Amino acid sequence: QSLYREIHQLISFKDVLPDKNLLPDWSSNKNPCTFDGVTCRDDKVTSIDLSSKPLNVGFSAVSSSLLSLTGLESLFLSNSHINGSVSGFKCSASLTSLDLSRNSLSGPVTTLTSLGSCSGLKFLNVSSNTLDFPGKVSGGLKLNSLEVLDLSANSISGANVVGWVLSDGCGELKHLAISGNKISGDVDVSRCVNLEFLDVSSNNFSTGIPFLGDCSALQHLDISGNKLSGDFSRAISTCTELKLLNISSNQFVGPIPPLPLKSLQYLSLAENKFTGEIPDFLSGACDTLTGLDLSGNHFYGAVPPFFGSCSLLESLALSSNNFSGELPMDTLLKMRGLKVLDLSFNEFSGELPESLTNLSASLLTLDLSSNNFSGPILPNLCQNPKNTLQELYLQNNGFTGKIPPTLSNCSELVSLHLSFNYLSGTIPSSLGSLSKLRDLKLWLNMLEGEIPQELMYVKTLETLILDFNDLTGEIPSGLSNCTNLNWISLSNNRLTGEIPKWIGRLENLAILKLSNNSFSGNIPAELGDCRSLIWLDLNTNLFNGTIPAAMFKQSGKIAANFIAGKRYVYIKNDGMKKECHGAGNLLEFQGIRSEQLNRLSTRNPCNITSRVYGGHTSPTFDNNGSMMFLDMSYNMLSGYIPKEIGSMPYLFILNLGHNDISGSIPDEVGDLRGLNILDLSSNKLDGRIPQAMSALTMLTEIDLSNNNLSGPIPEMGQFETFPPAKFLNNPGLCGYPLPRCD
Ligand SMILES: *[C@@H]1O[C@H](CO)[C@@H](O[C@@H]2O[C@H](CO)[C@@H](O[C@@H]3O[C@H](CO)[C@@H](O)[C@H](O)[C@@H]3O)[C@H](O)[C@H]2NC(C)=O)[C@H](O)[C@H]1NC(C)=O
């Protein structure tokens, strides 16, 4: 092709982009073979990659300019903010690959039929777009020369759409993916005798199992994420070359059927309803098996013994079934290659046999959490130098004794989780030597002593959770160093001192919970210098002085994102037990069983009966930024409520009860439109209930009793919804639910 042709083809494209600074070095009177994003061979344009650039233009621009370029052999416009839809066009016979993934291409999937113009196209990738389906299957895709086709993450909902894609032939198709859609029906790829890859995962398949025919070439089969309930073994029995089988997250039942093991490297039956015990016939895969996942089923028994021959198994996931017995380590030690071991949420029992130290050198994750082990945590653990182990999850078990200080020898450790045990002693100071550790969790134990000062040596620390222990002393000054700390929780201990003013230096602190301790002193106004704080719980303590009007400055300019994605539990306080205090207890809960929350009965008066909320952390705002939680009840605070309290929109809860807080309820409280709970009881508040609070349309719990309030209760809003008890012991008050104002 003439150089003249090439340059004009490419600059015409630039000259239709809203922002021409996206192709700043694309200029006329310049060989396009020097442009960023262009690839040439022998001075001729052969490929263009403009991915991840917000081109912000419609497909019609690409078809006329780029796809028309004679000689172009590949075009990559992934996440290039392309929109519009496909249509007929002149396609150079040279083009063999076209990647339009992660764009806004729209319209029915039948528009892709016009890509047949590209007589030589073999790789099409329109994933992560918004192409839908007409409604009734009508004809066929008719791109029968393709070898690779990805239609995943579109908006395709239909029946037998697969039959439509392969209607006119798939003799060349080696790779097919249509995951992330809502496609249901039957999958018949038996004529695609060359198919090696088939991903129909996360669809709406609920009837028959895909028909693979001779299945002579298939190496990768992923039908996970549907509602399949069929005899998949019969369909995959002829598959000689299968290397990966992912059927997880379906409605499968019964024991493990026979499987073709000759080539199997990965095998996941997880998140189904398989019963029974791990068959012995699965030994046939130990020659090839690299990853096994049987989690989230109803298997029982113990780790079979033939797993020693599985010398290649890099990961063993067996969690959330009903496996019992002592740690079958006599087998684990032959697993030279094991790097992830997850036996959590079963009923494995017994102590930790001594020979686990040898495996700590090969492993990267050990998860024995939520089982029934017991005895001391092996001190010698991580004696074998070069311990590459990164994650140690031993929580929710029956382990006892001091926390081994040898755990500092695992110098690559990144998360230590020994919560929900019966460990005594102190918190080892050598943990400060864990330079990379980011998560330290030891709550619900019997850990006496003080919080190690040597934690200052941990620059990576992000979460420190030591609730429900016998910890004492003051808050170590050394935590000021842990700049990345975003979740500190020290509730139900005997800690003392004041909140250090250096708490403000933590621009990443989001959750700070110090309830049921013996802290004291005026509330630090420096908390107002916390750019991430959304959860401040200080109930049941001896804090005094007034309340810093400065602590609410960050309202509106918070951005809490580090915190998203962590399992937790919130336990709502009933108004029954007077001993129970505070709005509720937010408590980290990664890898612990909710069924063992009964343990807290010995430390907590709260009657935790069907009042446990959970899930994974999910902050409402991204950068809007306001504090969501704020409890400070059962302290000795006094003074007047600053009008700055009403500056927190995303505030759900607000508990200031059982204090000495005086003055009139600021009229800004009504600006807390998210407020579901508002407690100000047992105080010295006087004046009237500002009519502005009738703007609060989401209040589900409210308590203003035992105060000096006087006057009428707003006839507007949710005040009539609540009972009298929430207003009693305020003689000056009147109005429904109280008596009318005589
Ligand atoms: C996934 O596929 C399932 C079936 O495998 C779909 O469920 C079925 O969806 C249809 C509509 O496509 C429902 O029809 C509606 O049913 C009621 C009578 O129950 C009637 O009010 C309407 O006229 C309409 O026909 C059908 O009931 C429903 N059947 C079930 C759930 O058993 C499902 O919608 C598909 N999508 C998803 C996201 O699950």
Ligand SMILES: CC(C)[C@H](C)[C@@H](O)[C@H](O)[C@@H](C)[C@H]1CC[C@@H]2[C@@H]3CC(=O)[C@H]4C[C@H](O)CC[C@]4(C)[C@H]3CC[C@]12C
């Ligand atoms: C982002 C992160 C920090 C948090 C933990 C987020 O994941 C959770 O969803 C947080 C936001 C919510 C979980 C449950 C908790 C309580 C549970 C409860 O008793 C409810 C009673 C009534 O129905 C009104 C609404 C209440 C108070 C809600 C308000 C939302 C919560 C705080």
Ligand SMILES: *[C@@H]1O[C@H](CO)[C@@H](O[C@@H]2O[C@H](CO)[C@@H](O)[C@H](O)[C@H]2NC(C)=O)[C@H](O)[C@H]1NC(C)=O
């Ligand atoms: C096997 O299938 C499961 C379930 O489809 C895959 O796990 C999902 O991974 C995607 C991202 O790839 C996540 O969005 C989902 O949340 C995951 N689901 C669950 C239940 O964890 C898994 O990655 C697949 N593994 C292989 C090797 O294909």
Ligand SMILES: *[C@@H]1O[C@H](CO)[C@@H](O[C@@H]2O[C@H](CO)[C@@H](O)[C@H](O)[C@H]2NC(C)=O)[C@H](O)[C@H]1NC(C)=O
């Ligand atoms: C998990 O299965 C175990 C056994 O594998 C169950 O606990 C056993 O239950 C049998 C029932 O006959 C008792 O005879 C055994 O004594 C129990 N074992 C022990 C060590 O006490 C257990 O109930 C199952 N779990 C669930 C949740 O169903």
Ligand SMILES: *[C@@H]1O[C@H](CO)[C@@H](O[C@@H]2O[C@H](CO)[C@@H](O)[C@H](O)[C@H]2NC(C)=O)[C@H](O)[C@H]1NC(C)=O
């Ligand atoms: C791994 O554990 C061994 C044995 O406890 C440690 O070896 C000692 O390390 C200390 C560190 O101050 C030295 O003073 C000693 O001299 C070492 N032992 C001997 C016999 O001299 C080793 O430091 C640990 N490695 C870590 C924690 O990374």
Ligand SMILES: *[C@@H]1O[C@H](CO[C@@H]2O[C@@H](C)[C@@H](O)[C@@H](O)[C@@H]2O)[C@@H](O)[C@H](O)[C@H]1NC(C)=O
């Ligand atoms: C706040 O408390 C300070 C410390 O006093 C000690 O602790 C308090 C909680 C009481 O138990 C008291 O008897 C103890 O001696 C006081 O110095 C301070 O004046 C108090 N008030 C204010 C407004 O700071």
Ligand SMILES: *[C@@H]1O[C@H](CO)[C@@H](O)[C@H](O)[C@H]1NC(C)=O
């Ligand atoms: C304690 O929890 C039980 C659960 O059955 C409930 O029935 C009972 O009313 C609760 N008691 C109090 C005082 O909250």
